[PDB]
Amino acid sequence: PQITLWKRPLVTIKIGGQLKEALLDTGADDTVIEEMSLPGRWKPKMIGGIGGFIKVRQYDQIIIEICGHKAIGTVLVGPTPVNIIGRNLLTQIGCTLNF
Amino acid sequence: PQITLWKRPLVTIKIGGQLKEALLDTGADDTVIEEMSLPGRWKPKMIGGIGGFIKVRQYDQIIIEICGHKAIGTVLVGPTPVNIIGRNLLTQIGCTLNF
Numbered sequence: 691p692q693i694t695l696w697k698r699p700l701v702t703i704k705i706g707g708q709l710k711e712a713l714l715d716t717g718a719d720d721t722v723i724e725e726m727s728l729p730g731r732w733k734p735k736m737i738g739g740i741g742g743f744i745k746v747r748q749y750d751q752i753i754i755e756i757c758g759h760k761a762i763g764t765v766l767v768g769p770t771p772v773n774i775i776g777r778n779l780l781t782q783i784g785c786t787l788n789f
Numbered sequence: 790p791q792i793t794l795w796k797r798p799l800v801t802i803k804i805g806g807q808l809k810e811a812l813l814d815t816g817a818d819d820t821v822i823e824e825m826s827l828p829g830r831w832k833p834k835m836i837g838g839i840g841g842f843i844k845v846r847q848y849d850q851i852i853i854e855i856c857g858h859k860a861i862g863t864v865l866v867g868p869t870p871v872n873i874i875g876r877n878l879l880t881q882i883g884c885t886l887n888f
């Protein structure tokens with residue numbers, strides 16, 4: 691698809707069998723999702739945003755479907771205001787910026 | 790152009806006669822630039838992100854050149870860690886996400 695930016699680029703994602711709404715975010719290096727349970731072990735990570743650096747849980751090799759496209763990669767879980775799909779997964783679905 | 794997302798989508802912009810590096814950010818509703826002087830009146834605004842909120846100065850009807858494309862809109866000025874080109878100006882240069 692071709693997504694214009696007059697409104698937030700929100701899409702449906704599927705993770706752990708659940709449907710959620712997430713923002714396609716080219717300004718985010720990593721994918722960060724609101725609190726949920728994911729399988730396996732997690733590692734600590736700090737992510738810096740507009741208000742500073744914060745603590746999240748890093749889960750690797752997580753299966754996630756984004757707007758019908760299958761991706762498998764790192765998902766960070768923590769107190770984010772919105773679910774964010776970052777560049778680590780946008781590359782997997784072949785997403786580019788065009789003008 | 791077509792911009793891939795293996796690295797941060799950083800571009801050169803021209804604002805208030807100065808050249809600056811900025812991030813093309815689909816996850817940002819608004820454009821936020823590091824401390825600088827801009828002409829005209831401003832009003833205070835709070836903007837929220839990962840890590841909480843920052844206080845910025847809102848300048849309206851500001852011209853920016855982004856990749857050679859002229860655009861006009863609201864520019865927020867404040868203690869942002871990176872210069873961000875948000876949706877308000879990405880729409881003006883005809884920027885879309887494609888996959």
Ligand SMILES: CC(C)(C)[C@H]1Cc2cc(F)ccc2S(=O)(=O)N(C[C@@H](O)[C@H](Cc2ccccc2)NC(=O)O[C@H]2CCOC2)C1
Pocket residue numbers: 713715716717718719720721722737738739740741771772774776814816817818819820821836837838839870871873875
């Ligand atoms: C809340 C949301 C709607 C999404 C956004 C809120 C927002 C709204 C605006 F109008 C303007 C700016 C911002 S913002 O700037 O707050 N932001 C945009 C993100 O793309 C930031 C940009 C950025 C990049 C580097 C340093 C600071 C900021 N990335 C980010 O937090 O990456 C983190 C997140 C995961 O990867 C690293 C989050």
Ligand SMILES: [Cl-]
Pocket residue numbers: 861862863877
């Ligand atoms: Cl605007």
Ligand SMILES: [Cl-]
Pocket residue numbers: 694883
């Ligand atoms: Cl358009």
